[PDB]
A paper describes a structure:
In this approach, the controlled removal of the mother liquor before crystal mounting simplifies the cryocooling process, in many cases eliminating the use of cryoprotectant agents, while crystal-soaking experiments are performed through diffusion, precluding the need for repeated sample-recovery and transfer operations. We have previously shown that the transfer of crystals to X-ray data-collection pins can be automated through the so-called CrystalDirect approach, which relies on the use of a thin, low X-ray-background film as a crystallization support from which crystals are recovered by excising the film with a laser beam and attaching it to an X-ray data-collection pin. The CrystalDirect system enables the automation of sample mounting and cryocooling and can contribute to closing the automation gap that currently exists between crystallization and X-ray data collection.
As an initial validation, crystals of proteinase K, thaumatin and lysozyme were prepared in CrystalDirect plates. The CrystalDirect approach provides a robust method for automated sample cryocooling without the need to screen for cryoprotectant agents, which is often a critical step in protein crystallography.
Author numbering: 1 to 279
The structure:
């Protein structure tokens, strides 16, 4: 399948080269997979979600996304126009308040929730969780992410936006999850992206167009925008049967575009998420 005039990051994930504008992907499109977006919520009513999104949990007075961040991230996973996996099911877990903030104990509860809740959902092609969030190092937060991954969920987490080594941030620093850095449309490391040995992969993160609250769209930047590219890619590849939740980070790294990014510090992988789709 080909989507013309796609956001640059979608085109990038299906290309061996920067500078193109059409996204190519197998029409299965993540059907039968599920992606949890653990964030500020999801505006499931947005026409871009086509009924495939729903809120499943909140720790606040509403399940609505009063911020936009979680809606944007969910859009990059699975919206019709802005998403990688255009037929996946999206499940929102609101662990962050409408200012984008949340306590670690709430974040941990939300990860444990997903590990159980997937047993209440139909996801025959597998389960992914996208965590576009983080703070300072916490062994408890890392352990929650490790348990979620161990339970059979492909956990993708943002590296962070400190232009620093991700070892000092959680859940970025958890070894067993997929830690995602950001790149720009010219194949540069995004200026804010964290780096380090703990990174597994980069994805598009500078100037990413996606859904926003109020039925709208906007372009924003962050490792929070790179993460859902990778989460959606995982869901897509799991529907294709190419990999599994336990192995998908490794598979994505094995099949990535290698050595194409600039300003990658020595000792950080130079790997850009790539679907290897051949029409």
């Amino acid at each position: 399948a080909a989507q013309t005039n796609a956001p640059w990051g979608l085109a990038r994930i299906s290309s061996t080269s920067p500078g193109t504008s059409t996204y190519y992907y197998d029409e299965s499109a993540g059907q039968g997979s599920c992606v949890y977006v653990i964030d500020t919520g999801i505006e499931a009513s947005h026409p871009e979600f086509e009924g495939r999104a729903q809120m499943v949990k909140t720790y606040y007075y509403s399940s609505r996304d009063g911020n936009g961040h979680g809606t944007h991230c969910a859009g990059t996973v699975g919206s019709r126009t802005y998403g990688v996996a255009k037929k996946t099911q999206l499940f929102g877990v609101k662990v962050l308040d409408d200012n984008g903030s949340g306590q670690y104990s709430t974040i941990i509860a939300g990860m444990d929730f997903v590990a159980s809740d997937k047993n209440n959902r139909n996801c025959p092609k597998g389960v992914v969780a996208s965590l576009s969030l983080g703070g300072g190092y916490s062994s408890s937060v890392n352990s929650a992410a490790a348990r979620l991954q161990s339970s059979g969920v492909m956990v993708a987490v943002a590296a962070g936006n400190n232009n620093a080594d991700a070892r000092n941030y959680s859940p970025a620093s958890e070894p067993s999850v997929c830690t995602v850095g950001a790149s720009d449309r010219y194949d540069r490391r995004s200026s804010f992206s964290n780096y380090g040995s703990v990174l597994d992969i980069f994805g598009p993160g500078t100037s990413i167009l996606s859904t926003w609250i109020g039925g709208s769209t906007r372009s924003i930047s962050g490792t929070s925008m790179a993460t859902p590219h990778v989460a959606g890619l995982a869901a897509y590849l799991m529907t294709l049967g190419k990999t599994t939740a336990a192995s998908a980070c490794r598979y994505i790294a094995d099949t990535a575009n290698k050595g194409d990014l600039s300003n990658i510090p020595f000792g950080t992988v130079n790997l850009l998420a790539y679907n290897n789709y051949q029409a």
